[PDB]
Amino acid sequence: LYDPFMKIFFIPMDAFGHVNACIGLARMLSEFEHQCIFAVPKRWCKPIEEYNFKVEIVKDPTVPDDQDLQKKNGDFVNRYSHTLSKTPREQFIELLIPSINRDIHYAKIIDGQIPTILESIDPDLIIIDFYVTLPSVVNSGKPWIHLTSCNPLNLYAGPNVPPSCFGLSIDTDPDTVISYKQFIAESMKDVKSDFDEWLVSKGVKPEPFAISKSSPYLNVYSFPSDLDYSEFGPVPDKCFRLDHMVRLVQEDPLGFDEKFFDRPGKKILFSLGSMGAADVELMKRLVGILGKSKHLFIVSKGLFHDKYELPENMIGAKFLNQMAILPRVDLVIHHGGNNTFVESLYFGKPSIVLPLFGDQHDNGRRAEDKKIGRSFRPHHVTEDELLMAIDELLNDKELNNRVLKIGENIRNSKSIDDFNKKIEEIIKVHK
Numbered sequence: 001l002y003d004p005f006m007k008i009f010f011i012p013m014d015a016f017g018h019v020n021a022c023i024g025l026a027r028m029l030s031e032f033e034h035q036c037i038f039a040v041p042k043r044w045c046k047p048i049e050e051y052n053f054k055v056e057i058v059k060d061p062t063v064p065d066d067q068d069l070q071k072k073n074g075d076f077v078n079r080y081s082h083t084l085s086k087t088p089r090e091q092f093i094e095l096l097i098p099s100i101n102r103d104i105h106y107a108k109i110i111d112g113q114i115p116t117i118l119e120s121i122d123p124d125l126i127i128i129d130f131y132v133t134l135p136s137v138v139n140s141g142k143p144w145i146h147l148t149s150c151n152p153l154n155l156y157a158g159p160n161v162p163p164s165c166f167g168l169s170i171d172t173d174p175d176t177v178i179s180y181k182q183f184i185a186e187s188m189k190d191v192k193s194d195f196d197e198w199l200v201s202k203g204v205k206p207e208p209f210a211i212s213k214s215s216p217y218l219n220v221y222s223f224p225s226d227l228d229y230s231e232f233g234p235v236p237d238k239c240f241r242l243d244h245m246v247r248l249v250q251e252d253p254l255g256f257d258e259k260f261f262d263r264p265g266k267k268i269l270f271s272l273g274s275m276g277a278a279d280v281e282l283m284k285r286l287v288g289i290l291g292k293s294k295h296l297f298i299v300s301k302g303l304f305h306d307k308y309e310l311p312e313n314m315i316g317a318k319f320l321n322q323m324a325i326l327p328r329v330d331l332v333i334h335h336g337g338n339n340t341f342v343e344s345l346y347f348g349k350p351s352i353v354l355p356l357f358g359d360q361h362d363n364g365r366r367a368e369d370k371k372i373g374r375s376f377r378p379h380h381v382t383e384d385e386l387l388m389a390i391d392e393l394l395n396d397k398e399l400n401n402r403v404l405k406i407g408e409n410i411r412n413s414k415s416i417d418d419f420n421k422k423i424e425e426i427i428k429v430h431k
């Protein structure tokens with residue numbers, strides 16, 4: 001009252017992989033003194049408030065106000081556990097379509113609430129991390145940025161480029177690319193038809209193939225320069241690469257006594273993400289193999305942690321302080337989740353990738369193609385392949401030096417500075 005900031009409105013899908021990439025970008029933008037506000041359901045309000053971001057609650061009467069954060073996706077993964085071992089084409093129909101039906105339900109539920117919040121907050125910029133189009137954002141008249149927190153293969157979508165979600169070779173011939181595009185379009189025809197009718201009901205022009213509209217302003221993604229798909233040309237039109245969106249801040253308990261770190265031996269973080277460990281039978285299988293390893297494991301045990309025991313070379317908990325753990329381990333065993341994958345590299349750690357579904361398969365392929373890890377299907381991987389791959393990566397000086405240099409390049413990237421200049425040029429013209 002007696003004395004170039006902006007108000008930034010973040011709309012993430014209600015899951016860790018979207019929320020944690022938005023918190024990571026918000027932390028980076030708050031260093032420039034921007035005010036970041038989050039539109040999230042009630043169960044996510046106090047957890048996001050612990051990072052000193054303002055929260056605008058959106059109603060979702062299909063999920064209780066006080067539900068555990070891991071129950072929604074955990075229950076879903078348990079309900080579809082039989083699909084996790086199937087080929088990527090069986091998964092697309094039996095799992096990814098059921099999964100995107102829940103994204104579409106949530107989009108419809110929140111979309112009608114966003115216009116009132118936009119009128120009240122009057123943000124300068126909207127940032128959305130969603131897998132489907134939001135009409136309230138398209139129609140807001142405000143500049144908006146689409147945030148890609150998953151592997152970025154989908155952004156390269158174009159003639160002769162393999163579609164995402166199948167772990168396809170970057171060498172895939174145009175005949176195979178079309179075969180997969182036709183499989184996707186036939187598989188999605190009913191879901192897309194219903195979703196396009198909803199877009200039309202709100203005055204938005206559907207996409208021919210996609211059900212996620214690109215921002216006409218800017219599209220920001222999280223992927224290391226050293227890993228990016230330069231095989232398919234430069235950074236795509238109206239896209240912007242950040243090497244990472246690692247929050248760094250994590251105010252959650254460690255999950256276990258820190259005295260485990262005093263135990264002598266190589267340390268391995270074994271996390272299948274925020275929902276992968278909900279396949280109890282897979283976790284009991286992988287824990288039985290790793291119990292034969294001479295190394296020490298910290299395990300992200302997930303929603304059903306009370307249904308299974310870890311052997312004595314291991315410690316774990318339902319949910320861990322992964323920001324606290326990563327710098328203190330030697331190797332990560334993960335599912336190829338794009339946050340976990342990039343967090344592992346930020347800290348300069350090699351990885352064993354066990355993809356469950358979707359974009360994980362593309363990070364499985366990428367770990368092998370860029371020689372920064374080893375990839376296997378978790379349900380079929382043999383005892384010998386998994387234990388020998390752990391020793392191989394721990395003792396491979398050339399691959400460890402490779403991932404250390406990638407870690408340094410990620411941590412020392414100044415791309416957020418160029419991002420900040422772009423969003424300022426966009427806000428100046430559009431209000």
Ligand SMILES: O=c1ccn([C@@H]2O[C@H](COP(=O)(O)OP(=O)(O)O)[C@@H](O)[C@H]2O)c(=O)[nH]1
Pocket residue numbers: 016017018020021271272273274275276300318319320321322323337338339340341343
């Ligand atoms: O024990 C855990 C398990 C997960 N995470 C975080 O939850 C997010 C999971 O997202 P990701 O894309 O890695 O996998 P998803 O859970 O989305 O499949 C990541 O940011 C992890 O850092 C964590 O902090 N502690």
Ligand SMILES: OC[C@H]1O[C@@H](O)[C@H](O)[C@@H](O)[C@@H]1O
Pocket residue numbers: 015016017018149150151273336337338339358359360
């Ligand atoms: O939850 C949405 C998605 O987040 C992404 O960052 C991960 O790659 C996927 O494992 C996950 O399905």
Ligand SMILES: OC[C@H]1O[C@@H](O)[C@H](O)[C@@H](O)[C@@H]1O
Pocket residue numbers: 096099100131150151154164165357358359360
């Ligand atoms: O490729 C874009 C996204 O499509 C979704 O249907 C999948 O569940 C995600 O894993 C993927 O990242």
